[PDB]
Amino acid sequence: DRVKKLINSQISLLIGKGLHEFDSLRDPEVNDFRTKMRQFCEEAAAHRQQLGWVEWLQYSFPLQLEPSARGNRALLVNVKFEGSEESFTFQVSTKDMPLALMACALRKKATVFRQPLVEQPEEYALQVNGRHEYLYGNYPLCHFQYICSCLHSGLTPHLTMVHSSSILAMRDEQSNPASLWSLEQPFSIELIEGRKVNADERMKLVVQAGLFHGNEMLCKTVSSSEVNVCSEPVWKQRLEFDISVCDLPRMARLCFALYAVVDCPIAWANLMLFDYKDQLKTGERCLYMWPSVLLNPAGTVRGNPNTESAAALVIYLPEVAPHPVYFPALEKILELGRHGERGRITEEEQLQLREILERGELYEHEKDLVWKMRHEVQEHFPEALARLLLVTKWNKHEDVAQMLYLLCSWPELPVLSALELLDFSFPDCYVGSFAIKSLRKLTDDELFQYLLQLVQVLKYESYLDCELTKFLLGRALANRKIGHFLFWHLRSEMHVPSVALRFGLIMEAYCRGSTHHMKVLMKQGEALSKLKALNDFVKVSSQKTTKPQTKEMMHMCMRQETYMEALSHLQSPLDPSTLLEEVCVEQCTFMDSKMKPLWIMYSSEEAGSAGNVGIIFKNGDDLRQDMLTLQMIQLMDVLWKQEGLDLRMTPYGCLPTGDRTGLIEVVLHSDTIANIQLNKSNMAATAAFNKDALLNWLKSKNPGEALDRAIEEFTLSCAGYCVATYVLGIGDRHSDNIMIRESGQLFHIDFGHFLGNRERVPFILTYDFVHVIQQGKTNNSEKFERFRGYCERAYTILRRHGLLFLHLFALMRAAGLPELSCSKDIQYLKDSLALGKTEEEALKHFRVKFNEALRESWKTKVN
Ligand SMILES: COc1ncc(-c2cc3c(c(OCCN4CCC(C(C)(C)O)CC4)c2)COC3)cc1NS(C)(=O)=O
C-alpha cells in the first residue's frame, strides 16, 4: 500500500525516469519484461535474506584477493573487537590464515577480560577498519589485497573482529519490506509515406532498404523511386527483396535509410521482422527515425522517442497468411537439421581444414570446405565454432537448421571463445544463448573485469527480455559489488534516448531485488546532485574572482546543513568498499582546467589513515574513454601479476555517473612531473641541473636506504606505462599528464586520446625518466637494460592475451566512442600487439621500435 507507492517514487527518482512513463507506452513487451523480471529479482531477494552469515559476507563483502591467488615473512597486525576502543598488536606470518589471527585475538581477549570465552574463531570475520571489506576464508594473509598492499607500503594492517550475530543483524536490517517454411514468395513491403522530413527542396528523397542478420546482408539492398523533397513525401510503392519469406532467419532486421540526392544523409530506422513472441510482423508500422550524424544495421530496432520532431516513415508489412505465423519451435528446427551427409575427405583435405580452423578472412573454396566438414568441426575443433558460424548461409533456412542441430550438442567453450560470440557478428538468439551458457562459469572477479563490455552488448540486443539481461541481473543480485557497478554503468547512460528505456527497466528490476541497495544508491545520487550544483557555482565564480575567493565561497556553500548532510556518510560510487565519511571542507578545492573539476577530501576516524580519501567530480566531459583506458591498464596489471610480474601500476578509479559527469579517484601523495620540474627555489628538491629535479624530489621523499626501493618502483611503473601507452596508442603525453607518487611509482592521467587517434603512435622513452632509472648516472647499462627486460617481459605477456584485448575492444564498439567506431581502430591493437607474427618476429619488431625510441630519446641526451 503506502510502502509500495513510496518505493515506486524512490525508484523513479533514482533511475531518473518516472515509472508512470513505462505504463504510458501501453507496450506488451515492456509490461511482460517488467512482470517477469520483477518476479525473477524478488526471488533472488528471498534467497538472499535467508543466506547463512558466511554466504551473506560473500554477497555483501566479496573477497578481494591478489590476481596470483585466484582459483615465510613476519607481519605486525592490529586487531580490535567491535565497539571497543582497546586494540591488540601482534606478530603473525604472511603464510598464516585469518582463523589463526582470530584465535590469537580471542586468546588475548580471554586473558584481558579474565574469562575462558565460549566464542570460537569460526564465529568471526575480520573487517578492514572503517571499510566495507572483510578478510575470511582459508587463504594465507598475503593472498588478500589489503594485506599485500600493507606489506608493500610498510603500513600495519588494522582489523576488527566481527561476530556472526553482528553480520546476521546486517543481513536482517537490509531485508526487502514484507508454417513459415511453406511461404516461398519473395519478402516484400509497401513504403507508404514520410512525415516531418527536413531537406533541401532542390533535391530528391530516396529510401534505401536492406535485410540484415547482424552486419551481414541477407540479400541485395533495394531503393525506392526518387521523389521531390517535401515535409510529407508519398511513395505508396512495393519494395521486393531477393529472399523468400521461408528463408528469413529468426533475428532478421529490416533496415532503412532516408536520404536526399542531387549524397545527403537524413535519417535511419530499423525493426525486427519477428516480434518478441516469435510472430512474423504484419500490418502498418510508423517508424520514428533517428537522425543521421547509409544503412545502419547495428542501430537500435526501437523507434526514436522524440515523436514531435523526428522524421517518420510509414510502411506496410503484408499479411502473408490468413492465420498468424510464428518462427518454428526448436523441436521443428532440430528435426529438419538432423538430416545431412557427413563430410568424407582425403588426408590432404583434413590437413587443409586443420590449417584454416587453427589459423581470419577466408576465400570461397575455404568457406565451402569448412561448411562441408562442419561435423568434424564439432567433434574435433569445437573452439572453431565462430568460424563455422561465419561460413553458415543465414539466408537459407535448411543451412540454419543444420547449423542449429550442431549448436544444440556443441560442447561448452572457454570464456575467451564465448566473449567473441557476444559480438554483433553473431546475431542468432540460440548462438547468444549458447554464449551466455559458456559464460556462466565466469568467476565474480572475471565478470567484474568484463562488466563494462557486457553492459555495452545490451545495446545490440533485439528484444528487452533476453538471456544476457537475466544473467547480469542474477549475477548483480548475488554480488553487491557487481550490482553497484551494473547500476552505475546503466544509470550513467539514462540521458541517451536510444537506451533510456532498456536501461531504466533493468535498473527498476534490480531495485525490486534490493530495496536496501536502492536506498544506498539514492544517498550516492543525492551527493552527486549537490556536487553538480557546487561545480556550477565554481564554474561561474572562477570567471569573476580570484581562486582564494571562489574557494572560500565553495567552502561556505559546503558548510550549509543540506550540503554537509548530502556529501557525508556515503559509499563511494568509485568503490563501494570505500566509505566517504566526514567531508573535510577545509581541504576541498577545484582544479584549474576548463571544467573546473572539484577536488573533494574525506576523513574517517574509524578507518584512521585509510579513511583519508579523495574524489574528483568532473562535469562537462565524457569520461567513458578514460574509464575504458584505465580498465584496460588494470587488466594488463592483472595479466602481468598472474605471471608473477608486478609493475607497480596505479589504475585509479574513473566512473561516468551521468551526462558528461563522473568521478575520478584521488591518488594522494602524488604530484605531476610538470610541477616537480618547475624546480622552485628553497625546496628540498631544488637542483643544479633541471635533469636532477625528479631524482632530487624522490630523494627528499625517500631519504637514506629507502631511495633504492623508490628508484625500483619508478623503473617498474615506467616500464608498465611505456608498454601500456604504446599498446593502446595513448598519445598527447606531456609533463602535465604524467604523475609520480612519493613511493616512486609513475602513472599517467587524463586519457584524452587512444588507438593513435589517425597516426601510428611510436614507443616513447623520455630522457628525464631514463635519468632516474640510471640512478642519475650518464652511463648505467646495467640498470637501463634491466628496464628494457621489464618492457619486453610486459609486452610478451600482453601478446599472449592478444585475443582477449581484441574481443573486449570488439564488444566496446557498441559504446559508440568516436575513437573506437570502426575496424581501423581495432587494427591499431592488432599492429601494436603484432598478432600476425611469431613471438620471435614480434619481439624483434618491438626491439626495433624500442631502439627507435631510444635514438629519439638520445637527441635530448646529446644536449
Ligand atoms: C579525465 O580527466 C582527468 N583525469 C584525471 C585527472 C587526475 C587524476 C588524479 C590526480 C590528478 O591530479 C592532478 C594534479 N593536481 C592535483 C592536486 C590539485 C590541487 C588540490 C592542488 O588543486 C592540483 C592538480 C588528476 C591525482 O590522483 C589521480 C584529472 C582529470 N581532469 S583535469 C585534467 O581536467 O584535471
Residue pair 370/377 in contact (Cβ under 8 Å)? The answer is yes
CA 117 – CA 701 distance, rounded (Å)? 47
Question: For residue 200, how far is the Cα from the chain centroid?
Answer: 42
Cα separation, 428 vs 825, whole angstroms: 26
Cβ(242)–Cβ(175) below 8 Å: no
In whole angstroms, what is the distance from residue 98 CA to residue 37 CA? 39
Minimum-distance ligand 1 atom for the alpha carbon of 595: 34
Q: Nearest 10 degrees: CA dihedral of 294, 296, 300, 302?
A: 50
* Ranges assigned E (strand) in 620-698: 654-658, 661-665, 670-672
**Could you identify the atom of ligand 1 that is nearest to the CA of residue 737?**
33
Q: Which of helix, strand or coil describes residue 815?
A: helix
For residues 633 and 649, the answer to whether their CB atoms sit within 8 Å is yes
Helix axes 2-15, 497-513, angle to 10 degrees: 140
Residues with CB under 6 A from ligand 1: 589, 591, 593, 597, 599, 616, 618, 623, 626, 652, 664, 666-667, 670, 672, 749-750
Centre of ligand 1 from the C-alpha of residue 338, in Å: 62
**Cα 848 to Cα 832: distance, rounded to the nearest angstrom:** 13
| 3 state DSSP class of 273 | coil
Q: How many CA atoms lie within 13 A of 616 on its CB side?
A: 22
Q: In whole angstroms, what is the distance from residue 541 CA to residue 553 CA?
A: 9
- Taking alpha carbons only, the member of 301, 295, 317, 280 closest to residue 209 is 295
Within 10 Å of residue 460's Cβ, how many Cβ atoms? 22
Closest CA to 10 of 569, 526, 518, 495: 518
Q: Give me ligand 1 centre to Cα 656, in Å.
A: 16
> What does the alpha-carbon distance between residue 783 and residue 771 come to, in Å, rounded to a whole number?
10
Closest to 123 (Cα-Cα) out of 114, 136, 110, 142: 136
Centre a 10 Å sphere on the Cβ of residue 743 and count the other Cβ atoms it contains. 21
Alpha carbon distance 217, 295 (integer Å): 11
b/e burial code for range 9-46 (CB count within 10 A of at least 16 → b): ebbbebbbbebeebeeeeeeebeebbeebeebbeebbe
Nearest-CA residue for ligand 1 atom 33 is 750
Q: Give the residues across from 134 on adjacent strands.
A: 127
- Residue 281 is given by DSSP the state P
- Helix orientation angle between 781-800 and 706-727, rounded to the nearest 10 degrees: 40
Ligand 1 mean position, distance from CA 317 (Å): 56
Phi-psi region of 130 (alpha: psi -120 to 50; beta: other; left: phi over 0): left
- Report d(CA 332, CA 671) in Å as an integer: 66
Residue 728 burial (C-beta neighbours within 10 Å; 0-12, 13-18, 19+): buried
d(CA 684, CA 98): 43
| CA 588 – ligand 1 centroid, Å | 13
**Residue position matching grid coordinates 568467476:** 443
Strands (DSSP E) contained in 141-252 are: 158-163, 186-195, 204-213, 216-217, 222-223, 227-228, 234-244
Q: What is the signed CA dihedral for 287, 291, 296, 301, rounded to 10 degrees?
A: -40
CB neighbours (10 Å) of residue 667? 16
**How far is 437 from 196, CA to CA, in rounded Å?**
45
Q: Could you tell me the sign of the dihedral formed by the alpha carbons of 346, 350, 351, 353, in that order?
A: positive
Query: Is the distance from CB of 130 to CB of 579 less than 8 angstroms?
Result: yes
Q: Are 241 and 187 in contact (CB under 8 A)?
A: yes
Q: How far is the CA of 591 from the centre of ligand 1 (A)?
A: 7
What does 332-382 look like in DSSP terms, one character per residue?
Answer: HHHHHHT--PPP---HHHHHHHHHHHH-----HHHHHHHHHTHHHHHHH-G
Are 512 and 42 a contacting pair, CB within 8 Å?
yes
Describe the chain by its helix, strand, coil percentages, rounded to 5: 50, 20, 35
* C-alpha to C-alpha distances, 20 to 3, 92, 238, 302, 507, nearest whole angstrom: 17, 58, 39, 19, 15
One-letter identity of residue 66? E
* Sequence-separated (6 or more) residues with CB below 8 Å from residue 91: 74, 75, 76, 77
CA–CA dist 701, 714 (Å, integer):
13
The Cβ of residue 150 has, within 10 Å, a number of other Cβ atoms equal to 21
Contact 80, 86 (CB under 8 A): yes
655: nearest Cα among 673, 672, 631: 631
User: What's the gap in Å between 616 CA and the centre of ligand 1?
Assistant: 7
Among 749, 751, 753, 817, residue to substitute to test ligand 1 (most atoms within 8 Å of Cβ): 749
Three-state DSSP class for 560? coil
Resolution for this PDB entry, in angstroms:
1.9
Angle at 168 between CA 166 and CA 170, to 5 degrees: 75
C-alpha atoms less than 13 angstroms from C-alpha of 799 in its C-beta half-sphere = 23
Q: What is the CB neighbour count within 10 angstroms for residue 153?
A: 9
**Experimental technique for the deposited model:** X-ray
- Written as one letter, the residue type at 203 is M
Tracing cell 513504403 back to the chain, one arrives at 191
The best mutation among 535, 616, 626 to test binding of ligand 1, ranked by most ligand atoms within 8 Å of the C-beta, falls on 616
In three-state secondary structure terms, 284 is strand
